Design a protein around this ligand. Structure first.
Ligand SMILES: Nc1ncnc2c1ncn2[C@@H]1O[C@H](COP(=O)(O)OP(=O)(O)O)[C@@H](O)[C@H]1O
Lengths: 450, 561, 123, 52, 37
């Protein structure tokens, strides 16, 4: 059925229908445009008029311009053949290949499938990075954010995990869904080339949204990605790893429209709905029904202005099972990966460690290294206050341990460390500390492993 | 058009409805599609309804029907083991209509009754459910069922020759259930955690806010309390769920055990989920549905704990509903109405003398999640002004591996004096003096560390080095607790004081030895110190033996001089 | 080289879909120049009033007119806007807008049953 | 050693691909011909769904 | 003593951070109430 525009203000367009009003969420198509222009119904204003939000620019629209109702919202052309393809934020080909041949056509908001089970995340995902696998293990079904800032190699880490991740002997096949949001043409060309050259593309679906793509397409990108992941996990029984960079850029777009939508702004100019939209994305992870598959997330959260308290990165922490926080200060000291060892945590870590999983001494070693590194970092402050020579012999050992932790445990010369390798390095550096100062390792472990 | 209506318009989240002439303000209404909504605005020619779900499933002309309940709740047999949501309904009915319950008459025909009176008992789930005359109903019992089996809808009794009573009843979650009086905070809610029970006590029927940034351990304090606190029943409103925090609890908690009995914790719990796909309306009503269920169990003479994950998300859901209703935004765009409402919620907490005597209580522990460290509005600000207790999880204390990560400098219990006598009479005569002394230690350490940050630690006298030594032992040996250890996961009241006296006794001996020119370096490497450090791991009183072991060891230091 | 195969099949598989469509549209384009076309045209306009819209009128090419004055005499009336192979309807003064076109409905089919046609072609 | 290793792969990363070219196009021809005889059946299925 | 000015300097800028920027999400919210009304 067809309607006519009665008002246009930036991204918001009002459209009057003489017959049949399109329901909220329907995709409408503007007639008379060179490129497809979608209007998503947001409200029924009364008097046969609906209020909509445009998925692309509204320059050149005229009052009276015609609009058709497509009869449905937007969707994902779901198929196992999604693997090996590079697509836009909307799921249109970017690889010069034909459009996807759907096995099913799925809504993308998270309503389709109802895939999740009421079971806890469990079992190992080998990223191939020692600072994740050994000390902050990623588990199937978990949401483990990379916490970074502008200038830091968070995207290099994200791409490396995409190339390397696997689920070591699992009866289930493994797949990656890689979604990039608001990236440059140069970055898009780089990501494409990387997936194609390495052969990582064979087991991955890639969604790329450019900075100059419509803001609405950026908002839809993570939803296309999560829907594909849930389809592969639930209908094909796969362990799927979803990598989303950068959530902060997603937020900049969602924030950009909140103003055009008429809302009173919240703190820092953000949308008042920041946490309940973001919840629609972090809720979508975990084991799927049947327990053959799972959806795991590695979202990238860059600190705007390096501020981890900004509402965006701060609200993301609750959606994760493991967090890796990168720090500019550490990067400027030449320590890469620039992980803050006293601000990276594992929420579900205890579910993936110990006898029959990693090794019985894993929790004790992790606790002792964390405690010693935190003390060592504080002592760097104390050295600055009093001078190196005024530090006690005991404190000097903890000071030195912090350097050893950074030089040998954090730093990897690119290199796939087994958990056994990572625990060995951990015990080697721990020897620097007095045995009498290992408060967090029971004597049983000292005798057996020291 | 009295009991039903028809959608005039929908978009912008508000459904305008023609009719519904008898609907109450704040009543749940039902759309033909199956969605629920709350009557927000009653106008001369429409009802404005907040939709608790997606409004594209609503179209102009759609039929709308009253539910008759305030947003209401069903209160009767079938509540236990049940899993609901923001507006009570299987994770749709509320209480099984088919399930048969063994009703036991506890009143005879001719008895005079009043609201709250117990007329029957149902072993629905051990727990024994107590059937009460609904509030606002009194008179003479003219008819009463005999001991048998009946479904909820059946009538078990008639009063004043015709009000009919069933085993369940309905109540507006928005209205706090009536009571004769609220008793004064007298009995501590024995947590088993030394820092809490000692320094920041919670009283049975007290409101103690849990506040701090995301990932500081707020929920974990709540979960440990439920696994070990001295409340018979727990009402968990696991709100602010996201990404998978729903499925994280869906098939997980059904396995968590009751440390006290070794049975599922759910066997004494009621879950109230608040997911993101749920309407702001449901999450808003979730605390009211929970508190009402909480008040229901305390009426039986049980001490229940109400854990609210969290109110920050409830105020965001409420701000969404208010802005959609075009109510004037204030600070952070929150409606003016929130402060009085939030306060009204926490006011329903307390230990009471239930209808027909007997004592029960509802203790509230609410999570605080500011937009991000700002710790202002909504959540924190308004909450910290109501609650009497605040346990500040400190991310810096956590990074330092000091557990529980509760900041002993920023936390407060207005309840310390309120609960001191329970500890003095039942645990130890010196509970209050001991915690005051430890806190003064920690207070002194804080001041010393500030100065050392400036002039360095080299000028420190032996007396000041000793205070830092003992202050450190308090932090590492007492404040820090290992939630993952099979033993230190829970610290009984008896164990908390015994560990305190070992530390305080080591302090006195330390200061006494220094005063007699004993090198602090000699005390710092005293053999008993390593044992004091592992005391939290001992499950036997072998811990108080450390006091004598400490004294003799200092004597061996008085010997060598 | 493995990719070098899949794409060469994709181009081939494409070409076949794009020829099945070429024909399917040739059928409809040359549909008016045969009989049974009038019974098609009316049945489209039937649904326009038979659906949600209240009655008023409809339009088409001036060669759909020889085959569209039946219920025109039953208080509706016909009217080229170059309707090609379809018929718009007006539900009232407040346009309403219901259009039943064979091209427009084809496009709502080449996506509805993209598999079934492939299933019939290859599988 | 490299001199006889780099020229090994090149003489295979030609033969291997060069073989794929024989495989790819023969499997392109192999998807067309299956389609092009059992084709009117598809056209039929579509038409029958547009004129309802 | 240039320790004072040092880390304590970090002090003044988390302090200053905190609010010419916070004080502003705000001059502008209230605009926003009847700025929006
Ligand atoms: N008592 C604790 N002991 C150890 N780690 C804890 C504790 N409390 C919190 N944490 C760490 O912080 C993470 C987040 O804690 P949580 O209570 O879920 O956060 P929130 O305050 O947002 O509710 C936990 O998964 C854990 O890694």
């Amino acid at each position: 059925e067809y309607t006519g525009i009665t008002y246009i203000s930036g991204p918001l367009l009002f459209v009057e229908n003489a017959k049949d009003l399109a329901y909220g969420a329907i995709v409408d198509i503007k007639d008379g445009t060179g490129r497809v222009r979608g209007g998503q119904v947001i409200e029924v204003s009364e008097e046969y008029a609906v209020i909509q939000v445009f998925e692309e620019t509204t320059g050149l629209d005229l009052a009276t311009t015609s609009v058709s109702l497509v009869e449905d919202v937007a969707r994902l052309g779901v198929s196992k053949e999604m693997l090996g393809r590079r697509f836009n934020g909307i799921g249109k080909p970017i690889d010069g290949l034909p459009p996807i041949t759907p096995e099913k056509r799925l809504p993308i908001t998270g309503l389709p499938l109802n895939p999740v089970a009421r079971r806890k995340p469990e079992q190992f995902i080998q990223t191939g990075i020692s600072t994740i696998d050994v000390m902050n293990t990623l588990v199937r079904g978990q949401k483990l954010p990379i916490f970074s800032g502008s200038g830091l190699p968070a995207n290099e880490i994200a791409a490396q995990i995409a190339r390397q991740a696997t689920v070591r002997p699992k009866e289930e096949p493994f797949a990656v869904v890689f979604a990039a949001m608001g990236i440059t043409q140069r970055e898009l060309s780089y990501f494409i080339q990387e997936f194609e050259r390495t052969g990582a593309l064979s087991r991955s679906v890639l969604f790329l949204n450019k900075a100059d793509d419509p803001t609405i397409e950026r908002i839809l990108t993570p939803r296309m990605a999560l829907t594909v992941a849930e389809y592969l996990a639930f209908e094909h029984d796969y362990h799927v790893l979803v990598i989303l960079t950068d959530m902060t850029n997603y937020c900049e777009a969602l924030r950009e429209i909140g103003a055009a939508r008429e809302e009173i702004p919240g703190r820092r100019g953000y949308p008042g709905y920041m946490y309940t939209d973001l919840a629609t994305i972090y809720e979508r992870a975990g084991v799927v029904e049947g327990k053959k598959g799972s959806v795991t997330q590695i979202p990238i959260l860059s600190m705007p202005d390096d501020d981890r308290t900004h509402p965006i990165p701060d609200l993301t922490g609750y959606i994760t099972e493991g967090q890796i926080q990168l720090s500019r200060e550490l990067h400027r000291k030449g320590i890469y990966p620039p992980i803050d060892p006293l601000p990276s945590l594992s929420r579900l870590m205890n579910n993936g460690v110990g006898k029959g999983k990693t090794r019985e001494d894993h929790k004790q070693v992790s606790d002792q290294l964390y405690s010693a590194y935190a003390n060592g970092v504080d002592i760097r402050k104390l050295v600055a206050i009093i001078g190196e020579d005024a530090l006690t012999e005991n404190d000097r050992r903890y000071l030195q341990f912090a350097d050893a932790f950074e030089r040998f445990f954090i730093n990897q010369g690119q290199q796939n460390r087994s958990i056994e390798e990572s625990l060995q390095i951990a015990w080697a550096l721990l020897s620097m500390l007095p045995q009498g100062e290992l408060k967090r390792i029971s004597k049983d472990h000292i005798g057996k492993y020291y | 058009m009295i009991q039903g209506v028809i959608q005039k318009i929908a978009g912008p989240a508000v459904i305008a409805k023609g009719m519904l002439g008898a609907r109450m303000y704040d009543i749940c209404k039902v759309g033909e599609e199956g969605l629920v909504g709350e009557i927000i605005r009653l106008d001369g020619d429409t009802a404005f309804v907040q939709v608790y779900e997606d409004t594209s499933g609503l179209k102009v002309g759609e039929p709308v029907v009253s539910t008759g309940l305030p947003l209401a709740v069903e209160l009767g047999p079938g509540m236990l083991n049940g899993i609901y949501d923001g507006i009570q309904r299987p994770l749709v009915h509320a209480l099984d209509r088919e399930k048969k319950w063994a009703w036991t008459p506890m009143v005879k025909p001719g008895d005079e009754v009043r609201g709250g009176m117990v007329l029957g008992t149902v072993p629905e789930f051990g727990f024994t459910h107590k059937i009460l005359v609904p509030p606002d109903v009194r008179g003479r019992v003219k008819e009463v069922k005999p001991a048998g089996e009946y479904t909820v809808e059946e009538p078990v009794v008639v009063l004043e020759d015709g009000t009919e009573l069933k085993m369940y009843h309905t109540w507006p979650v928005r209205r706090a259930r009536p009571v004769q009086r609220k008793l004064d905070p007298n009995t501590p809610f024995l947590t088993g955690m030394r820092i809490l029970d000692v320094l920041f006590p919670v009283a049975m029927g007290g409101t103690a806010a849990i506040p701090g940034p995301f990932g500081s351990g707020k929920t974990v304090t709540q979960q440990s309390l439920a696994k070990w606190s001295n409340a018979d029943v727990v009402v968990y409103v696991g709100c602010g769920e996201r990404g998978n925090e729903m499925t994280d609890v869906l098939v997980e908690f059904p396995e968590l055990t009751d440390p006290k009995t070794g049975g599922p914790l759910m066997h004494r719990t009621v879950l109230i989920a608040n997911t993101s796909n749920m309407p702001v309306a449901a999450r808003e009503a979730s605390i009211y549905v929970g508190v009402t269920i909480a008040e229901y169990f305390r009426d039986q003479g049980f001490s229940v704990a109400l854990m609210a994950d969290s109110t920050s998300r409830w105020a965001e859901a409420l701000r969404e509903i208010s802005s959609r209703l075009e109510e004037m935004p204030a600070e952070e765009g929150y409606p003016p109405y929130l402060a009085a409402r939030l306060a009204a919620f926490y006011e329903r907490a307390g230990k009471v003398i239930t209808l027909g005597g007997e004592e029960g209580a509802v203790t509230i522990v609410g999570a605080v999640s500011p937009p991000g460290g700002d710790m202002s509005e909504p959540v924190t600000q308004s909450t910290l002004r109501i609650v009497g207790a605040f346990w500040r999880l400190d991310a810096s204390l956590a990074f330092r591996r000091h557990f529980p990560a509760i900041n002993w400098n920023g936390s407060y219990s207005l309840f310390t004096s309120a609960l001191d006598p329970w500890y003095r009479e039942n645990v130890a005569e010196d509970y209050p003096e001991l915690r005051d002394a430890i806190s003064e230690l920690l207070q002194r350490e804080a001041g010393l560390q500030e100065i050392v940050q400036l002039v360095g630690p080299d000028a420190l006298q032996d007396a000041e080095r000793l205070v830092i030594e003992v202050g450190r032992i308090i932090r590492e040996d007492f404040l820090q607790q290992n939630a993952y250890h099979e033993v230190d996961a829970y610290c009984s009241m008896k164990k908390a004081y015994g560990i305190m006296k070992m530390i305080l006794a080591f302090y006195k001996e330390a200061e006494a030895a220094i005063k007699r020119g004993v090198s602090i370096d000699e005390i710092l490497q005293l053999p008993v110190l390593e044992r004091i450090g592992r005391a939290r791991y001992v499950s036997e009183e072998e811990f108080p033996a450390y006091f004598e072991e400490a004294m003799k060891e200092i004597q061996g230091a008085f010997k060598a001089l | 080289g493995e990719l070098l195969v899949a794409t060469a099949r994709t181009q081939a598989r494409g070409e076949v879909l794009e020829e099945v469509r070429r024909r399917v549209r040739e059928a409809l384009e040359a549909l008016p120049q045969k009989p049974e076309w009038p019974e098609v045209v009316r049945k489209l306009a039937l649904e326009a009033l038979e659906a949600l819209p209240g009655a008023k009128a409809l339009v088409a090419n001036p060669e759909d007119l020889p085959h569209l004055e039946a219920m025109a005499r039953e208080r509706g009336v016909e009217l080229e806007p170059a309707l090609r192979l379809g018929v718009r309807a007006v539900g009232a003064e407040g346009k309403t807008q219901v259009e039943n076109s064979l091209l427009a409905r084809m496009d709502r089919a080449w996506d509805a049953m993209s598999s079934k046609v492939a299933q019939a072609l290859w599988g | 050693l490299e001199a006889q290793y780099r020229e090994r792969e090149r003489a295979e990363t030609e033969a291997l691909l060069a073989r794929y070219r024989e495989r790819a196009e023969a499997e392109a021809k192999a998807v067309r011909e299956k389609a092009m005889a059992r084709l009117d059946e598809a056209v039929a299925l579509v038409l029958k769904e547009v004129l309802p | 003593i240039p320790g004072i000015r040092a880390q304590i300097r970090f002090i003044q800028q988390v302090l200053e951070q905190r609010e010419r920027e916070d004080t502003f999400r705000l001059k502008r919210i209230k605009g926003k109430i009847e700025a929006r009304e």
